[model samples]
Target: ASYTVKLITPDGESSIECSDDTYILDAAEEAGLDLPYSCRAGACSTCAGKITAGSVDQSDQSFLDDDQIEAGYVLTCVAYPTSDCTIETHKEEDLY
Candidate 1:
């Protein structure tokens, strides 16, 4: 039910624990990390990022194009990890 969320931040790698039912971003916040975000809703994409090597159950609109999703892009605020996941937060701006 819980998964390890490893985030590669600008400072360094920050790992957090999250449940399959918990949004990745929220989980990161619980760890007191500076995970980016504006609107927690799917309408915005400021918190959009990618999955390196794991699965996340899509919970809501990620505001990402199909190609982006296929490329591992996800809205961290709405992403629920289904498996252990590695992520990069600040790089969300660089990603599409």
Candidate 2:
């Protein structure tokens, strides 16, 4: 399915269309925006963002606890959009 992802960085926001099979961060890269990320395995919170308005299913979430996931924290490096999504980057400092 085709869906749009809106990435909100400290600099600003960017929106682009992407496949459900694509990672959000990869889509950002395709759109010429580099989002902060490291360790693409979903083992760390470097790519974590708030799923402010939609759904996504990720490869893994060892970086986040159940509460963080419940609170809408998602690891963008490993996430695939299950639906259209809006993500706010650099929100949770404690995870760093």
Candidate 3:
């Protein structure tokens, strides 16, 4: 299934339709926004964001710990929306 994502970024907010099979970052890129990211395989946290309104399937990720995941932190490079989501991007520092 696909859903709309509300990405809250440092510059501003953007909305994009993302599929459950597509990574959030990739969806953002497809929508013409170049969001920050390093490793696209979920081995890094450069694409970190916090899900404030919905959930995602980030089981492919390995960088974030259980606590971080529990706290709604997601590695956008590997995160897939499970529902229409509202996420705050550029939040790598907040995870520290």
Candidate 4:
């Protein structure tokens, strides 16, 4: 299914439609927003962000630990929306 993703970045907020099989970062890219990223394999925190609202399926990500996951941190490169989501982009630094 497809869901609305509200991305809040240092610039401003941009909304994009993300599908269950689509990564948040890729969705943002397709929508014309340039998000931060180094590794797109979910093995790094370069594209990390926090999901303040709604939920995502980030089972493929291996970077964030359980605590980070509990804190709403997600690897945007691997996270797929399970529902409409509100994510704070460019938050990789906050994960450390």
Predicted structure with the largest lDDT when compared to the true one: 3
Better of 1 and 2 by lDDT: 2
What TM value does model 3 have? 0.92
lDDT against the true structure, each candidate: 0.76, 0.79, 0.85, 0.84
lDDT of 3 at 65: 78
The alpha-carbon lDDT assigned to residue 11 of candidate 1 equals: 82
Q: Which parts of model 2 are misplaced by more than 4 Å? A: none
Query: How well is each residue in 26-54 modelled by candidate 3, as lDDT tens digits?
Result: 99888876888888778887788888799
* Distance from true location, Cα of 12 in model 3, Å: 1.5
Residue-level lDDT for 91 in candidate 1: 51
TM per candidate comes to 0.86, 0.87, 0.92, 0.92
lDDT of 4 by residue, 11-94 (tens): 988999899898998888877878887787688887878788988898888888798888777888899898899987777777
Give me the runs in candidate 4 sitting further than 4 Å from their true place: none
Candidate 2's TM-score reads 0.87
**TM-score between model 1 and native:** 0.86
